[PDB]
Amino acid sequence: SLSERLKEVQDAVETAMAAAIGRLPAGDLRDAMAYAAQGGKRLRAFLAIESAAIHGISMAQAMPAALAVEALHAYSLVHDDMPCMDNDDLRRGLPTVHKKWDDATAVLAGDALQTLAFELCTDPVLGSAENRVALVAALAQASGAEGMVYGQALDIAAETAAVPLTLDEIIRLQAGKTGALISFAAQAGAILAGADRGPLTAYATALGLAFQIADDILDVKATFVSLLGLAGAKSRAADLVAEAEAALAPYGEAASTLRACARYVIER
Amino acid sequence: SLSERLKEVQDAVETAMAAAIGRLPAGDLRDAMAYAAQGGKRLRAFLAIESAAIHGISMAQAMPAALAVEALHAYSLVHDDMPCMDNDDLRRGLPTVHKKWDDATAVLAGDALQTLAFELCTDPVLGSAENRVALVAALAQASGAEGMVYGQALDIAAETAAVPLTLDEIIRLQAGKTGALISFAAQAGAILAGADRGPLTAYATALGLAFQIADDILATFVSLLGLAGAKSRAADLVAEAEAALAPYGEAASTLRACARYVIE
Numbered sequence: 001s002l003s004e005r006l007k008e009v010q011d012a013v014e015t016a017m018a019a020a021i022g023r024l025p026a027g028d029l030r031d032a033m034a035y036a037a038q039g040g041k042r043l044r045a046f047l048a049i050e051s052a053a054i055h056g057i058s059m060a061q062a063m064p065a066a067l068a069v070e071a072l073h074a075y076s077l078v079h080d081d082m083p084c085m086d087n088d089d090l091r092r093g094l095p096t097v098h099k100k101w102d103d104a105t106a107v108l109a110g111d112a113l114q115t116l117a118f119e120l121c122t123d124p125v126l127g128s129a130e131n132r133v134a135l136v137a138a139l140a141q142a143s144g145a146e147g148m149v150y151g152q153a154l155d156i157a158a159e160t161a162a163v164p165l166t167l168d169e170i171i172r173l174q175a176g177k178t179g180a181l182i183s184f185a186a187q188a189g190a191i192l193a194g195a196d197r198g199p200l201t202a203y204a205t206a207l208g209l210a211f212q213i214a215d216d217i218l219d220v221k222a223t224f225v226s227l228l229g230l231a232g233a234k235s236r237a238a239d240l241v242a243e244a245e246a247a248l249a250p251y252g253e254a255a256s257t258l259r260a261c262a263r264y265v266i267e268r
Numbered sequence: 269s270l271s272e273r274l275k276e277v278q279d280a281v282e283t284a285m286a287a288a289i290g291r292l293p294a295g296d297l298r299d300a301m302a303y304a305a306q307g308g309k310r311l312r313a314f315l316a317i318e319s320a321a322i323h324g325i326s327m328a329q330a331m332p333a334a335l336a337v338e339a340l341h342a343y344s345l346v347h348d349d350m351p352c353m354d355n356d357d358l359r360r361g362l363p364t365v366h367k368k369w370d371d372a373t374a375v376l377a378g379d380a381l382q383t384l385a386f387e388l389c390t391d392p393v394l395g396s397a398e399n400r401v402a403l404v405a406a407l408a409q410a411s412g413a414e415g416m417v418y419g420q421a422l423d424i425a426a427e428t429a430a431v432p433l434t435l436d437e438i439i440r441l442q443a444g445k446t447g448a449l450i451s452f453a454a455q456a457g458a459i460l461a462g463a464d465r466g467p468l469t470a471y472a473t474a475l476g477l478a479f480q481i482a483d484d485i486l487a488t489f490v491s492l493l494g495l496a497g498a499k500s501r502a503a504d505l506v507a508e509a510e511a512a513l514a515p516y517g518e519a520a521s522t523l524r525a526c527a528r529y530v531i532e
Contacts (some may be wrong), residue, residue, distance in 0.1 A: 006416070024413040024414060024418075025413065025414065025423075027418075027421060027422075028425070029413055029417065029418065029421040030413060033413065051458065054390055056273055059409065079375055079376075079379065084370070084371035084372045084375065085375065087380055092354060102352065103352035104352040104420075104424055106492075107347050107349075107350065107353065107375065108421050108424075109378075110411045111347060111378075111379075111382065111417050112413040112417040112418075114379065114382055114383070115382070115408050115411050115413070115417065116367060116387045116408075116412060116413065117413030118407075119404075119405060119408035119412065120278050120410050121404070122401050122404050122405040122408070128397070129396070129397040129398040129400070130395070131403045132401050133390050133397045133400045133404070134385075134390075135385065135479060136386060136389065136390050136401070136404055137390040138424050139386075140383050140384070140386045140387035140390065141387070143383050144292075144380045144383030144384055144387065145292045145293070145297055145298060145301060145380035145383070145384065146292055146293060149376050149379050149380040149383065150292075150295075150297060150380075151292055152376055153295060153296065153297040153373070154295070154378070156372050156373075157295075157296070165516040205493065219488065
């Protein structure tokens, strides 16, 4: 059951995240962080826990990694919603951090949520120091100027430009903006097991692009719908989900929960 | 001698930082990062390099930590310079990042500079994985909601609070905002050698306070202690900084000179 499993992960992450932030000193900065990290479908946390499971690793052992990726995701949104960025008053129908506190508080809460993500990677519950440093390196690659921040920067620049982006450009944007962090989550189980990262990386590359394509289809400047056509976007998204499922053939029947997740990304 | 030791550290950090940022994809973002991390006196880089030397660790083996604290410090500047924060138009004679690019590019460059500091901490040259993960935790403890960001958030509240803060309060405030990152840099050497961090921590505590106090000679320490009562205090704390390193004996001479120099 993907839905039940998804629900179990959401509930476990919500409780754990609350606690993690709770031990920080009191104040507007902690409340803002706590608020930003509350809720969400928890896709990334799910991929970390699920990919750990495939390598026989418990949720309790995997949790700090799940927390770190949700923390990193949360901070990215806190900043992206800001006026000079995407300028969103609402996130899932509730006021954004910068609206509920101010712009200064949103800068600071996202800054500390990124710091929190990295701190979480150091928790010895995760396992050997060797796997933990590989975890930090992988998070940093995905989140920084080669991954997440780079694709945000491409996307901010795209929002202005009076020449729409090409397919090759929007693919590069999406690989960093969205693709990179999902790939971190998917590989996190392999990192913690000291195992081949290959299949989960390939899975994630396909899943990440299906994810963004699906977003665009529901969303009705170049998009996957404007570039590929509506039926063309839908067909691409389904072909990438099949590519993602095929990437997990090494794992046999144990890949079925991850195969279902890829299908879920586009089944809306 | 300390003067030439610092300049040889400044040139070596400048090249190493340029190369580290240079390996990133091109664009405004990498342009902004390079500009933000360029120049400065490198006190924190110097601390990391000299704390490693005290434990018999080469500059090259300590460089990624010297780079990480400088990367972390530069990011904090880029954000703090912004209109919703300190709202500075110039830094070191030149337009700040949000002026030269825009507010959005400042957000993102600072964001990626923090991520780069954490990447730097995973570099195999630093030594064992256990020591690198210890370096990572210490960096996050120092930089986040328990540390630097915590102190910056307290600072923003201060200037809109009902009445001025007291002595104790501005001390706790600066211990986070200024002291925590300097303590990381001073401890890096001990962290990388897997040795007692005690003396370096106590060195940094005193030095960080004196740094801020000398950096007030342009409310503040001078408002509550006076023109001269702030000088003597900073001089006292330099003395305490030096004494914290007594267990190292005379091998402490470069760090001790570094502390005496922050007050001129």
